[PDB]
Design a protein around this nucleic acid. Sequence first.
DNA 1: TTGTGTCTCCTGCTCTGTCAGCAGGGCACTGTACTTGCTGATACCAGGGAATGTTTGTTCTTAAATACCATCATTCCGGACGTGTTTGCCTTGGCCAGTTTTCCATGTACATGCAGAAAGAAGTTTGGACTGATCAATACAGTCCTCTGCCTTTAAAGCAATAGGAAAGAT
DNA 2: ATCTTTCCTATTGCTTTAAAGGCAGAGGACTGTATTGATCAGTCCAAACTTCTTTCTGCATGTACATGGAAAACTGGCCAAGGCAAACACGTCCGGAATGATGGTATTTAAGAACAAACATTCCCTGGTATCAGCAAGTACAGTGCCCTGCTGACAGAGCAGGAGACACAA
Lengths: 109, 116, 53, 95, 95, 97, 97, 83, 83, 102
Amino acid sequence: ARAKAKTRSSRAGLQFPVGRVHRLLRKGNYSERVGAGAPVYLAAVLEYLTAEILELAGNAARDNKKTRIIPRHLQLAIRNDEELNKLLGRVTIAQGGVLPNIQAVLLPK
Amino acid sequence: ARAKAKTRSSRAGLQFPVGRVHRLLRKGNYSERVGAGAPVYLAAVLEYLTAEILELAGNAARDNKKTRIIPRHLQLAIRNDEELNKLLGRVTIAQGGVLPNIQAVLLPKKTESHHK
Amino acid sequence: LSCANCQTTTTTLWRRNAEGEPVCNACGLYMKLHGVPRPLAMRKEGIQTRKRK
Amino acid sequence: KRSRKESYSIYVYKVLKQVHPDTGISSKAMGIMNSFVNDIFERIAGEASRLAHYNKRSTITSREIQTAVRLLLPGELAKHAVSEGTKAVTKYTSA
Amino acid sequence: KRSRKESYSIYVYKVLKQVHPDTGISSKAMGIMNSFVNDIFERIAGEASRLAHYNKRSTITSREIQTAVRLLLPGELAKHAVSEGTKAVTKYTSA
Amino acid sequence: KPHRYRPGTVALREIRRYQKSTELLIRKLPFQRLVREIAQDFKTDLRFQSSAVMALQEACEAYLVGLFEDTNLCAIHAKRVTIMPKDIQLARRIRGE
Amino acid sequence: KPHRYRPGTVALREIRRYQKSTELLIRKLPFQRLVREIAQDFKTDLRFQSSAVMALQEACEAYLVGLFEDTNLCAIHAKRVTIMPKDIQLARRIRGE
Amino acid sequence: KVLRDNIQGITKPAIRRLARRGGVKRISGLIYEETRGVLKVFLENVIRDAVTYTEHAKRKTVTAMDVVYALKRQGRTLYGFGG
Amino acid sequence: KVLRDNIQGITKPAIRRLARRGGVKRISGLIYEETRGVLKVFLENVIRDAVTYTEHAKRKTVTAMDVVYALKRQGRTLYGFGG
Amino acid sequence: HAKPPYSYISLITMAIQQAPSKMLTLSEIYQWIMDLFPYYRQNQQRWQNSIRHSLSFNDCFVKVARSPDKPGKGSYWTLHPDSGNMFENGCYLRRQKRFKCE
DNA sequence: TTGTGTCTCCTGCTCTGTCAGCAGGGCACTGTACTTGCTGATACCAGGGAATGTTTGTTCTTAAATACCATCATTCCGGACGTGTTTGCCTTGGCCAGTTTTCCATGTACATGCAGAAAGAAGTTTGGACTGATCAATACAGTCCTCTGCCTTTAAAGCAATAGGAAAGAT
DNA sequence: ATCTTTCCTATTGCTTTAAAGGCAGAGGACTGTATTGATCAGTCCAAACTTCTTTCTGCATGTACATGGAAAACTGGCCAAGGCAAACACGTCCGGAATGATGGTATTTAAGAACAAACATTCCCTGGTATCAGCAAGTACAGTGCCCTGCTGACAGAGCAGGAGACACAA
Ligand SMILES: [Zn+2]
């Protein structure tokens, strides 16, 4: 009989879905075939980036004495980090606002 | 007996290759299936665009008293046409140069005094 | 101006024959190379087939 | 043997002879025209693939190409290109 | 019921609980994170497909994903993501 | 004598206020009317989802805020503090618009 | 006295000359050495096709010419004719680089 | 039914608020018409693509996904409305 | 064999010629070092991607197509090198 | 030769009036005076400077340009219409109530 | 016989002649740089012939798109009330634009020499073709369990009110 | 430096609304086997790169002179900021209804797959016409100095009107 099913995420030690990523790769017309390790690698990378942004955004939410992350905290996390700001340079965050920044010349004497 | 072959480009009245365009659409992983009229439409559009650019480039070549189109003439044709300039704004043409353009404020003025 | 030999009104580089009258580039080169005038049958010609705005 | 390299040179030359019968083109200009045709093909094909994906269509049809042309080309280029494509498809269907 | 519409919400929430056990997230923020994951997926997958096409390969392998990550992510993010992906593939290969 | 803040004080106050907040700064109803007016030229009798109009407003306000940041930089480059149409034009020209 | 053009005349002459032509303006061999020096930090014992180095030089010169055009616009904005580091910095800032 | 001059609905206070969020301290009097023109051009460019996407789907309602795709096609990716 | 200080090979007259093609009349004395730095950054960014493409192909020679792809993915599409 | 009784202002006014088109320039005025007054063939610099000073100072004369650049090298001076007649009734030498715009 | 209007001569204001200086602007001359026209050299593109791999034609299968209907959800229009925002006006302050000055940091031109460009040659080294081998992905069927929709509970955020500290502006 | 005014932040209490948690099912992931086609490994070779040597300059470096552009200082007026008051148009919600989007069924059209023929495209090879190189006239334009033409500060000198002295007329 068939052995007990184990998700590929559990085999790879990931929280993100390896199976869904593989299916989306197959259905996206990216290539004729998809390797076994490609969805694992891609899911691991996506999980890492999500964890990075969530860590920074949780820090920003804590700085505001807030318990829940809102778009403002995601914007603050992204634009205060050089790497993420470079990755997401051309992206607009709805309800994210902007970083507070006044040019020094505009301040009073 | 089997009817004599006739190219789809001739069937559509085009100079560009309908069969090659269809093959490239199939091989490029753009979609699972490709309609019969899709390569015809695409070949016609590509032919129209290249005809437009070649006409403008030939006019540019004639203005320079030349007979062969060179990259400079393609650059002049593209950048002098607002729509082609919009389409190919982010494109660099090797050995194309730039349009002659000097800001008006950089040109010399006339001084009241004519002495050294 | 026009070529004294074949009478094309446009050429890439006007040249002059032994008699001093103007000749177009192809006829001048053909004369200097072969010693014979360039045939008008050898001359090519064409008419535009496509146009737009 | 050695692999052959296909290109659009002969077709670009035929179009040139149509528009300017007495004009020629240098090899570098022909290479630029090849780059241009490949670039525009890739833009239109990618946009058509995106359109089919958004609407959950499996097949890229002439309608997808027409919409991609309307999206990519600006202004009068889009109108004239749509007219040319429609004319070509009608001629192909009638024959 | 309405037609099912999948998303990354549960996985983003699990990662959040892993990183900030006591922090929550609003629905708008979760939508932004879902858009972010879709965007990065599309970027990496498109770059990998282009890499496979350039080399005349039919399959996208973990090497294509690694090269795409190197090309797309900047600086330290690239190497950290490469380490994470290699570690995950090593774990998976041991079954 | 009535109290009055000197010029530029309330301007800096408003800069801080609106850079701290995130709500939309254009009134929703007139922006929706503008969107429908522009859309009627492309197609008649167009329905609109509310979220479509909200996405349009978010994109427009983000674009305008970024443009004003570039315009402010261009103005300061000319040793001014007042933004002028020439500043917007230069910013648009360099951005490639 | 010997003839001597006033400042800016030969500069305008050179502008017209180099906007009329198309040849590459950087010397080929030192640019090739620079390319190899930069490449050696990413991988050792690399080889380059000649066309690859030519493509790199073409792209770099096009990029620098465009950047100088934007820098010139920025300098003109501040009522100057001399380009300065601040002009390049503003141009690269607005371009998003 | 028909709407005529709604561009003026983008009032001077709204433009001033947008400038303030952009960090601007002092605003010239001619900025407002310039901003209205720029905004109208941007909106036309986005809405044309959104309506094209709507028409291709044979729909008569412009959805948020149409706007998101139109913005993404122009290098202005928007998060928070996709899906 | 090792190359050390070839950035200075981008001489002052070369930068002057590049500026002249850009329409610049007068050039500050400090422009040359800034231009060298900017060119260095641009070349590093392009060559990094080109060498990444070369390594993925398991080749030891950087081909023109590697450069073309590297430029294309940075929004710097180049015609005339087999694109 | 004896100095003419006429003053420079009267001479200039008469030269302007007698022209076919009521128009003359400084060079044409010089030619006319050379023709019809042999007295002024000496002291050339003196009377040239005097004529220039008088023409620049007197408000009854107003300058007019040349439209298609003409032969050039000068400008055209016309009598101000509001001047009327000032030297009428034999008063060529010294005028009364000098014309003024203000 | 004596006082005042009118005629004659001297003096002062008007206005014109004469010096002198500095400015604009037109025009002539010298010199440098670019363009045009011609001839001769060369190089590169057009045209003709072999082969190969790609397109076209025909048939069958199948699945993707089409037409009709139903229904439900979701968008449009109108109406009503409250009040926050917009518009217009007035006051004034400080920022932008114009003008002047100085000097330093750029442009122009000359002279020297050095390394870049081009050609030749040799070495070498590696990118791609070819063959066989192997291994990893696809396809199919059957199992089952993870994720999404629906519904309920509660705590994080929003709103209102108050009080204290910070900062701006005037004296 | 001190006092008044305004704004902002921080704290506390109520509530409301949005997120977290629980449950059902179905569609999508997982397991196992056979097929097969993609990829890997080793060999070879030719062509494309790298390296070294020689000439020959054209181009870069360094120098000196002096021009003019950038920056600083000053002034003022006019354009924008701040604040008050009335109106008005937004925001919220509620209801009716018309529309359009989704889903399901019958079906009809079109695309994929397979196989063979042949024909269009690529590569290879030759001439001849465009393009490049060099020289020499011709043209255009910059830089400079001279002259005419304008305007203004300054003085000095004839013309002619007005006041003073003498004659003739009125009282
Ligand atoms: Zn001829």
